[PDB]
Amino acid sequence: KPSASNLIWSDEPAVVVYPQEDKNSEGSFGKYRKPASVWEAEGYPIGNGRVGAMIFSAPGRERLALNEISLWSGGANPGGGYGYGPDAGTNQFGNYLPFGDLFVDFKKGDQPASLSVEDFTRSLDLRDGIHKVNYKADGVTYDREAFSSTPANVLVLNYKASKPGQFSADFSVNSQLGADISAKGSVITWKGMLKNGMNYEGRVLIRPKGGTLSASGDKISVKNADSCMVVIAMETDYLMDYKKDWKGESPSRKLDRYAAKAASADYAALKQAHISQYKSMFDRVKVNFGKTEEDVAKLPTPKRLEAYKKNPADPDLEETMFQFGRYLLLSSSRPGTLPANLQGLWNDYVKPPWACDYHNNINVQMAYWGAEPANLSECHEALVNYVEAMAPGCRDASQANKGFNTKDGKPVRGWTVRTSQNIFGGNGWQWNIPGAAWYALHIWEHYAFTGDRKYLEKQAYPLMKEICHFWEDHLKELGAGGEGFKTNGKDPSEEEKKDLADVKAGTLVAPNGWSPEHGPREDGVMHDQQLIAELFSNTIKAARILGKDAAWAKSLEGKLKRLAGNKIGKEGNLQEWMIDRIPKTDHRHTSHLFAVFPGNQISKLKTPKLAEAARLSLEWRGTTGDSRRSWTWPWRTALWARLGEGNKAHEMVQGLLKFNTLPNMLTTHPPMQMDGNFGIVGGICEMLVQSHAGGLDIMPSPVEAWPEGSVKGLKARGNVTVDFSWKDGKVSNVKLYSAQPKVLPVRVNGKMTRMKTLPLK
């Protein structure tokens, strides 16, 4: 009986193909059309935040498509273009790249291993972070395991069998980048230098027990061994420091310190240390949404998802999706290394969709939506450390932009970003002028959730203040009744000016904005205003907590009160623009609901009239086929959840799974984009616990699809850990934990109580 949840698995061997089209036979793709389509749907991913693999296991062959998170082309990209590809140099944007592949060709004796196998399963077990294969052939049971170890800092593979002397295979490395590959002794080494100067090296260290080991050509063969452990180690000379030209130690010198040592350890010891580190992160949150029918829970994941599409009743599969988002984030994001990109850290493409980059118009943010509420707070440090380290490049691009110059012709203070960023301070494509303000929301929430004052004073507040200065420089002043307002460059019409009537003098608006991704270009679009008000408000809070810059903070509190704010339109919707344009639209985006989520300005508790207007706006967006994207479902999940529509929020979870999830549970835009996986964690957390509206609010509205369940380990602002259960329409067993004894207002079961915390075990 395969576990009903936290296990992704298939009874079908993976399709194994080379990422280079020309390297594959006529029908090697099975039901797919191209190697990329195979890769995104068939692979199971492992990672330790820095190195990872997408694993394609079959009885005859096995492909590990390999990644190290810093392998990037491109560079400073001073012209702001969006050119990429593996040969992109310092004057271009560049892209995340594939590191290599390990191919394993299994043999029986000296002939190919048979595919006449029995009881084949390949599985990604989320409970221990291990990819597992198991099958039977000719009375012999074979087992494979693979994981990405944080303590050992390598990928570890292990092949075993029920009888001695049964393991034979040929190991080979594939590169799409022209790497130089050579085998010697028991190690395959591959290395290269990108056109932008980045050096990289990988090593595959083969460690059989028994049998023979020979190195012919650049392949390595193992014959008639008992078992075989493999270590895969990979490094670049990337260093996240612009003052060092982004260059640190050579990759060979890094690998010399640890790879051989890891390959010399005992497999059982490597495995135990991995599982222990892994559970220390994964086990922080446990949820139960209900019990799926045993006949449905027995289905392999591809068939279970096809079944879900026709009858979406599978709370255990939804629990798996939720935990997969946590698994993917902890596997792609750690404090000392780069943040998760559009695909986490997994990529097979030399020219990936959207450069597999850092998109700050929603994607990178959504990637971190689960970091704080789902108890993976240290993962969020990777994002903030990145933002700090890329800022000198953003200041360069922002100062070079004469369009940002103040009225005195001086360059702007602070910085903002273009829509895309690489790992060298480069910015690409359209300016995303409020994007740094949105970064500042993550910078503040890391403090709101942890209470880490050192973080706030040393890292967060200096960034926030600089982003504020940019807006103190770029905001535009309006006269009474909208005097000065521009829309698409022209003055407002007489009908338009009727909306502009109540605008007091000195009103501050972001000039010439765009509500993402439709309409006109005009002053004070509500998306911009909300992002700025959130930036100013949180920076002001930070200053007073740190007792710093009191004068400028009260100065800012005045500009905050002068910003154009939210308006309820004549039809009752929340306005998306200063002008009262019709809310009936199918448009995908709901950019003026930022203030409901992920922002903090509109809540049911604190601003009921604005919330009901927001709820009408979202209702009138409807749900059409074009509103189906990897990133719409999780945002609408969180929105509906915060607006008290639990059932609507659950319908968005179902929609993600029905329409935008691949057979391996990776979300797809299309093509594959992990924002959905990452973001649905945040959306589901808001269905269970809210802490943005003045205190803890536990399951504020029911979810009929989850009549009975429980959670342990969710995080709330102020660094509180939350456990509870629910059954019928009642929440019970509410228990709050903190490090310091506190007393808190708690809304639960429709009543506002006050409870004290228990100490954090």
Residue numbers in the entry: 25 to 785
What did the original publication write about this model?
The high quality of the electron density maps allowed the trace of residues 25–785. The (α/α)6 helical barrel of FucOB displays a deep groove where the active site is located, mainly flanked by solvent-exposed and flexible loops, including loop 25 (α7−α8; residues 357–386), loop 28 (α9−α10; residues 429–458), loop 33 (β19–α13; residues 547–550), loop 35 (α14−α15; residues 587–614); loop 37 (α16−α17; residues 651-655), loop 39 (α18−α19; residues 683–699) and α-helix 8 (residues 387–392). The O1 and O2 atoms make hydrogen bonds with the side chains of N387 and Q697, respectively. The O3 and O2 atoms make hydrogen bonds with the side chains of S444 and H383, respectively. A third glycerol molecule is located near the first glycerol molecule. The crystal packing analysis of FucOB and FucOBE541A structures reveals a strong π–π stacking interaction between W453 with two prolines residues, P765 and P783, of the neighbor protomer. Consequently, this protomer restricts the entrance of the substrate into the active site, supporting the inability to obtain a complex crystal form.
We discover FucOB from the mucin-degrading bacteria Akkermansia muciniphila as an α-1,2-fucosidase able to hydrolyze Type I, Type II, Type III and Type V H antigens to obtain the afucosylated Bombay phenotype in vitro. A close inspection of the crystal structure revealed that FucOB crystallized as a monomer comprising three domains from the N- to the C-terminus: (i) a β-sandwich domain (residues 25–260), (ii) an (α/α)6 helical barrel catalytic domain (residues 357–712) and (iii) a second β-sandwich domain (residues 713–785). FucOB as well as other members of the GH95 family follow a single displacement inverting catalytic mechanism.
